[PDB]
Amino acid sequence: VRGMNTSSAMSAFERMEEKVLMQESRAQALGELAGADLETQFAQLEGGSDVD
């Protein structure tokens, strides 16, 4: 309940931080790829194709 440093609580904070940062890092890596026009073009093409 306290959230004070503990054998279980301490481990949980670090792991959660790692999960948040790793996901953010992946997103950061992803956004650069996302920024390029070709990636955007594929999504637009797919939507038209999907509707058909």
Binding site: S8, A12, R15, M16, K19, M22, Q23, S25, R26, A29, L30, L33
Partner: protein, 51 residues
């Protein structure tokens, strides 16, 4: 009888606490499984990222 009542109350409180503790570990286990899934996804993204 007075001692028994005190013991019973303590036992009931302890049992409730144990159940709460049991619920917490289960949640932690679920969280751990979820955490593992997130880690696996990142590696795959990285592999895709390089190509």
């Amino acid at each position: 009888k007075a001692s028994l009542d005190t013991q019973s109350t303590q036992v009931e409180t302890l049992k409730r606490n144990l159940i709460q503790l049991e619920s917490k570990i289960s949640e932690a286990k679920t969280k751990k499984e979820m955490l593992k899934a997130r880690i696996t996804t990142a590696k795959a993204q990285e592999q895709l990222q390089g190509m």
